[PDB]
Amino acid sequence: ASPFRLASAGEISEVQGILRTAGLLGPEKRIAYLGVLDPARGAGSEAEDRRFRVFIHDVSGARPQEVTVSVTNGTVISAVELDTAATGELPVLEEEFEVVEQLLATDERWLKALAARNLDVSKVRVAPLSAGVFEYAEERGRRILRGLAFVQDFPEDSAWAHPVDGLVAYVDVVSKEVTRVIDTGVFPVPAEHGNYTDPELTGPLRTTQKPISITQPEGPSFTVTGGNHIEWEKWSLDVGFDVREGVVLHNIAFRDGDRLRPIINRASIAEMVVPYGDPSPIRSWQNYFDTGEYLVGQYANSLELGCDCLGDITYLSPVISDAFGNPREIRNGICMHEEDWGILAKHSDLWSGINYTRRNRRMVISFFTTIGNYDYGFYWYLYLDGTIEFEAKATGVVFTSAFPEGGSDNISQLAPGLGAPFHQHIFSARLDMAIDGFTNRVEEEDVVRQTMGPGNERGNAFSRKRTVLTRESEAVREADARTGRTWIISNPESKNRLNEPVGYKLHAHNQPTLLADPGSSIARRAAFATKDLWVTRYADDERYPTGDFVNQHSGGAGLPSYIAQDRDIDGQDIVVWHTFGLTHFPRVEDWPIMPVDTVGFKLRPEGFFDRSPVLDVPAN
């Protein structure tokens, strides 16, 4: 019944049939993206109309198409041919990854480069990576992938331990040509293995860990209805899933007495970029847009009970399309559970004699994705006290290179001869805000220091200031940790009992933003990552901070072009885009498999409630 329900196997099958009958899904066609569209703005939208957006690739070279179909009515709404030299290429297809290694294996320049290094071509794996846009005019309008080589000494060996430096190839994956093979010189291939399950490396496993048992003898406190609607401790929301963004949260609201109060209309990680900081021509082009180029949802893991998710776990198993339109289920791809979170509130009062302690809890909604060597966990947390938090967990195997004789300013050494280039992992959270409704505004709040003098004779006073962001051209903001900068999203038409606008405060981690030179290709294509906070006016088609077609797009798409409309955002339907990331100088302890590191952000109520919202939590 809900318009926000997960897509079902049947809906995807019907899309495939509609496309096929319309003549849009022939044998040379491939589905590069398929996803359900959210309902358009309309608080009285009753007539159910499930619409799906499809990107259709053509393996013969014909122009691709963007298609919108209505599953409810069984029709094609629109179909537009795309000029990819102008608007960007479609996301990389899983089947194109195989092509790169196979093509290079018969190229005489590639074989000659391997022969010089005495490498057996049957043992050389090729990481197929996105191309970006640089100086090669012949790549405009063409689907390119670039390949870097790694040696696998045996089928169970970790090839990442054995990078083949000084060698890179470019491949046209539709015409199946190797356009360039660049050999800048021979580097020794690092010899030590990195097999973290080999007992020779792990040593004997510990026998000292005793079990921790976490159970819920009466079951969990949350309910799931209609497949994906969650109710938990006054919270209400819908858990969506999209093959590009992954888990998406809809209709986040809090039951305050008798009123269901909206907070956030849609929350997602709308892009994530991994730029590399090694100036070697072998890797100086390397920038992953994991969401926009690869689609993080299609690489979601099946999460194992007791290993990935511990406790009383409720699973969702989302359905996506494969490249031919058949439904594919990601079994146990989303974990949901509640967790103890320590003390919520505590006071022992001398004068009243009352000793009071209450415990906190959080709702966890998580999924994990694997893109090549990297594995990322996406965690959304809901707390009893109204706090909303996102956390990304980065693990996997670091991307490697040779470590040069004489050192490097841009690579760290992990093992003899083995390097790890410096890089960042930068996320963009897209928060379609709805604080008590859609009339919202953002204020930037700085601490204000005061000088000793009249009205502050002891020099102890300090204060704060708030600046309303009234237009998009003034809504591109930078962090300032030294002045305690935060941003408040408020509803100027909804007041608390003290007659102040209700609000939520965004607390950032204030990590560095994109470090690349502002004139670089990556700074133009990932402009969102150069600033901590953007606020736009809501529009149906402004979905991603990098635009719809990120792969090989020349730059400026997305947030810089949206912001240029300079729309009114003072008491309007607005969207907050928060940039946050990790700057990774790899350490020896990251090798051969990296312990989790984390980054995120949180939102806390700021006069949203008329008093603490957790006074009715029991002691038990």
Place this chain on the structure above:
Amino acid sequence: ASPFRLASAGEISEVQGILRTAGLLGPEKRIAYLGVLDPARGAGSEAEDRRFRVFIHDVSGARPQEVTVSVTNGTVISAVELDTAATGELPVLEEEFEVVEQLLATDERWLKALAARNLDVSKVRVAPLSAGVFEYAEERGRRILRGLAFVQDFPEDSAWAHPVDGLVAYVDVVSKEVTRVIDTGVFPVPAEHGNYTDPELTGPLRTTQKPISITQPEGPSFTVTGGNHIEWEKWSLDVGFDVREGVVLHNIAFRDGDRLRPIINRASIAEMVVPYGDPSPIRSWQNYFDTGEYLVGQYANSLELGCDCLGDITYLSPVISDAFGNPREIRNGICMHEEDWGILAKHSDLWSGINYTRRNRRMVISFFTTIGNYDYGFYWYLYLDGTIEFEAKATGVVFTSAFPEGGSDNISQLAPGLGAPFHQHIFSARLDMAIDGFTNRVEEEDVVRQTMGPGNERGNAFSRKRTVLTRESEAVREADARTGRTWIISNPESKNRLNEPVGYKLHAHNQPTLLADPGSSIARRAAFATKDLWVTRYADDERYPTGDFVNQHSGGAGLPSYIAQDRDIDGQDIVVWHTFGLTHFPRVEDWPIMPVDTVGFKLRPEGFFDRSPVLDVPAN
């Protein structure tokens, strides 16, 4: 056996007997502080010599004394008379707090002020607060407390809901004299109650929370020997307890193969300051040095199983002295347990076919203290992967005032007529470092941005720089979140297998430091709080960033006087002092009892190990 064992009841009784026999503890004497001294530098040394330091107050007004006792040999080692007008007053005695309300109840200026407000003196509670150093010349050399009034409507009423603004009194707690009563005008006493156990305020309690059961069916994975020595998952340490500092961690080391490798010799929170930013003369003197003036260990709570600490809990019950030298046990004052901490490391490799997941754990050592309206939890965490983390949890009831008609730049409104002055909570962690031994240095690491040009033609390169701090005069450092600034503590004489010095990296939260004007009294007394990082050369008597005697002490002691010695810290026995804190603009949701907010820091291995230290963790 161990020199680092907790003080026993017998040891404290023996100190009492030694002081009595020596003539230093007659009926007019009071013990204001008593604690065990750490062993001097020198491995093994004096077989066993347990020494205690004692601050002895005299209630007749004679000069107090600082005394060192050997409980092993039954002797007084040294006893010095203190000139408190020069070097500072002793910590506040618990029995002095009770004096303030009683003295004021019979002062005719106080009574006239209450009568002007139609308040019954029997219902007026007085919060007795430390006095600081301001413009009152008659206070030099006297023990002064200042009092602020709150109305308690009935014995179980929360008095914090009813501040009596416009009124403050100063009390000499030795001569039992009210020195000044200041009345700047009548303010309405806020009328709403703040009784968070009253059903009329809580409403019906939730019935929706189902239990979460955390058990360890084989018991915990850590062992406790000698009363306070902990071994857990390669970690080794001793848990100390001091009445001033609270929980103190000694001899933190990690078992790496056959070698026990030191990391931290001693870790503590050596001071904490809570400055208020309201320039009203009623409160502009208000600054709590909870550690130095009040002694946070003295007010540690007994922690309730299942409420304060959840799971399979091991308790310690530290013993302290009362004001007469009798031992007082703080039953269940320290909780210790291990906690699941999600995913440790995870990778699903396409080429090898190996799927690998491991879970993380942490060891938790915690205590909670209550100082008037505020309650603070102190949490030390040890992780499987070598990370050490500290977290402070702030809760309790916010300190209140009237909310002025017309508003305020320095006070938040929480309820009709009820205000909460702006303030900070700032901690100083004292880390006596011992990275692989005592020869350590500190480097400051900043990210380095690089310009597009020769050697970086695509403008993607970025790097980092490290600056060694060679002498104390250059070791006073500020945060820079924008450049990703961190500090590395390393051992230049101990190298990992890549021939790089082993190290640990300190990651700060980069919250604002002390906001008061640098000319203010609090900026001089809490100079440590104006900078994020200090590094000193280790010295036996340099224990606290504020000096030994903080109460009513002007500037002149502590970290600014230590660093003036400008000693060599480049490969030497060094101490890191890290300032970190919360800036609190109270919100409506903080009332009537505040949900926990947190701040802290962590240290991560940086080439300390030759590879990941958790390759031997089993799959479970």
